[PDB]
Design a protein around this ligand. Sequence first.
Ligand SMILES: C[C@H](O)COCC(COC[C@@H](C)O)(COC[C@@H](C)O)COC[C@@H](C)O
Ligand SMILES: C[C@H](O)COCC(COC[C@@H](C)O)(COC[C@@H](C)O)COC[C@@H](C)O
Ligand SMILES: N[P@]1(=O)C=CNC(=O)N1
Ligand SMILES: N[P@]1(=O)C=CNC(=O)N1
Ligand SMILES: [Zn+2]
Ligand SMILES: [Zn+2]
Ligand SMILES: [Zn+2]
Ligand SMILES: [Zn+2]
Lengths: 422, 422
Amino acid sequence: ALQTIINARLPGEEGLWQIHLQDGKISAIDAQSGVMPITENSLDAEQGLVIPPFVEPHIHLDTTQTAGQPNWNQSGTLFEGIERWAERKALLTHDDVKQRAWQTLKWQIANGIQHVRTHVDVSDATLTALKAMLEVKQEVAPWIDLQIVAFPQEGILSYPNGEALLEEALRLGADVVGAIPHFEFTREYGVESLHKTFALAQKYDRLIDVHCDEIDDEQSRFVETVAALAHHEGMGARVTASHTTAMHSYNGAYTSRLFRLLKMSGINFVANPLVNIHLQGRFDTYPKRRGITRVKEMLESGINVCFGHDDVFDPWYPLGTANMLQVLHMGLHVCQLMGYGQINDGLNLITHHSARTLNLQDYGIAAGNSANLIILPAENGFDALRRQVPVRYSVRGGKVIASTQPAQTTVYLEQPEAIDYK
Amino acid sequence: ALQTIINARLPGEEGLWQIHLQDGKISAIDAQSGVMPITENSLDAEQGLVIPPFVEPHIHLDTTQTAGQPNWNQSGTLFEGIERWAERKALLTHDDVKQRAWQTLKWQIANGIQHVRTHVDVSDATLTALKAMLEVKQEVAPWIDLQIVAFPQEGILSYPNGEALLEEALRLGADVVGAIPHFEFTREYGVESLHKTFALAQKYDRLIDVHCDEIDDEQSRFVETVAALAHHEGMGARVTASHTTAMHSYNGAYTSRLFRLLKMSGINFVANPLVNIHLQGRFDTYPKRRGITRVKEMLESGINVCFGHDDVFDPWYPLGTANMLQVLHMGLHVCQLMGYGQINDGLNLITHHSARTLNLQDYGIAAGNSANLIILPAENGFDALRRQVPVRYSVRGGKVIASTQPAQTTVYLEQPEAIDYK
Ligand SMILES: C[C@H](O)COCC(COC[C@@H](C)O)(COC[C@@H](C)O)COC[C@@H](C)O
Ligand SMILES: C[C@H](O)COCC(COC[C@@H](C)O)(COC[C@@H](C)O)COC[C@@H](C)O
Ligand SMILES: N[P@]1(=O)C=CNC(=O)N1
Ligand SMILES: N[P@]1(=O)C=CNC(=O)N1
Ligand SMILES: [Zn+2]
Ligand SMILES: [Zn+2]
Ligand SMILES: [Zn+2]
Ligand SMILES: [Zn+2]
């Protein structure tokens, strides 16, 4: 029964802090006069940084851990990835999906992630993975709040009974409506698919998260429809456009015009740096574009943007340990957000901005909130990112649900010396 | 009571000419045998060039003289200009609009302009500026024939009650229906907005003048809809596409295909060189595009194109004295219309071509026409343009309404010498 977290640093605050817990909530946050001694019912943050939990705003738990089954994505493209997945989707079972999803979820718990939005492919007359994931959501609830997106991987209009399958997924309980307009057979299907998506979200009162313009095509502008529909319906906060990698290739004048709408609409954006750097630029020879959306410009304009991992060992990404600091590291480099302050503030892109994207209400280190928080063995955001630190403790509802004993490195010179990389 | 203009040159004609006036009209035009002596009731053109009055086919009298109020357009872009104007539009009053409009109108009278088309922003639930401008039109009528365009600056579909406000502006008496399809939230709104514009123009029997593709976006092709709708309705002469700066960036094959429609449709084009050179190319680094529409090619194809000033000391242009020869000078340079004949014929782009754009019937130096004409202290169009001459006399209905006594320059060398720059 934890009553207190002691010796904690807080981003943008001086000195150490004590965090009081009561009935699974944060009751008070008080400055310390100095380093406090450990007491019973206290958790020692050891002068580490305390932040709300990491968020994964974009992952595919139904595809996770399937890379190479039955074939590998040779070209490393989005489009071959979808073909490889279709082969694997034909082999899906209820137990297979739950086993793989739980494998990745456990890594996420270990990595201080307590909020996860997973897309699940509902281009499947059996809805096997969707129904299994609805179960996983209930099973993992003590540790992770899981959102499920009904994601029509093969299109709403371009796949047999796609719209009916999408609606059935919502009826069954999916939290978010997805779409994939750039993968529809025609631009017209793409636009119409978004109208159907927004109509479904309003009918069932659900969130929207579109795989939007994930393609190096300067003519792929489905994002303007997503934002306009959100604005018309006054539902900006409930709407996310994921990827928008085509925006990397837009001319500047169109982008400037578009940004007015993006700001007015209030929609959210997700960039997925690990996967984007791998899948984008694949049709260039040299020079090769980076292919990540306009993260720097969005931040400058006060548009909410955040980072997801997207894929863990699957047809679209052969790596991953589901680590958000690793995602952030890649994102800061590729987006050239490399000023000291930008790097230090980077934690926001995998915490607060992502919580906003998921429309979370109970999130942040503040009195009255659930005691959901993590402790990093680092002095600040810059230090955590630079040293790629693990999560020392993850606390949920005032209980410890994960812990890492950090590695210990020693060099043997004229005498043994501990190395902290500081 | 002027009965005659004597000692006049006419474009493309030899020697001097006498212009007879009767009841505010031109009664006859007769060749002179030589220089005639001044007589009572005669106006001496002093061997200057006589042409019909200058026309301003595109200006914003509601925004004129507001640059820097309350803030400056820092980026020098169309899009920031609109944001700055929105701030100023919130401060508009009836007297403010009339005072500023009249300030610029007086400069125009002084500059030999007797026909003016002003756009007025009707994205305003109060229609303050539109109603004030309807009054100004009546007040200035003895000196300038003013056309008012109901211009939905913030979009027809993308602004609250935009369509109803646009229709109310026409009901109140606006001469021309405007639109701004490239500023609408989506391409679909852009296209639909033009359908609504043409429907309104047919319902009220009005002209159309669209701010069309004023953006460095090669995908901005609203001009083809404007031309197709005009062609379908058989109303080409009544339709104008302003700016079309995106055409500067089109590929050549599409442009060739498009030009067939532009010619068949018979619509008019306005280019605005002073403003276009300033606002366009702002999203390029280097090299930087010029950004003016395809004026040279239009002229080669017999498509009617003309030049406007667009803005005078406002959020989109920090300069101006409302001078059409200055506009022409910029246009000839940027469009590279720099052959001797092209420069000499340049006056057409600010007289006859513009009169056609405004659909004027009573215009030109010909017997039976109103005695509306101006006198330039120049030998021909080339001379007028090269020396940037003022207007010596402006005559309207056979009465002098403006006059300039030209500057006199002297250099003091071994003796005083007059300098005429010839
Ligand atoms: C390591 C990992 O991949 C497997 O863990 C087993 C697990 C068992 O689910 C129990 C459920 C809540 O009723 C989840 O992890 C353990 C619990 C305590 O969190 C999921 O196994 C999936 C099979 C049964 O298809
Ligand atoms: C210099 C300029 O900016 C102001 O001129 C005053 C002017 C007075 O209007 C009289 C009207 C026809 O009833 C127009 O110019 C004079 C006339 C003779 O042409 C316009 O003033 C606007 C105010 C009253 O909000
Ligand atoms: N890269 P990603 O987000 C993963 C799976 N399917 C997609 O279409 N895109
Ligand atoms: N440059 P301009 O013609 C002037 C005002 N408003 C516009 O949208 N364009
Ligand atoms: Zn089951
Ligand atoms: Zn995805
Ligand atoms: Zn009034
Ligand atoms: Zn204009």
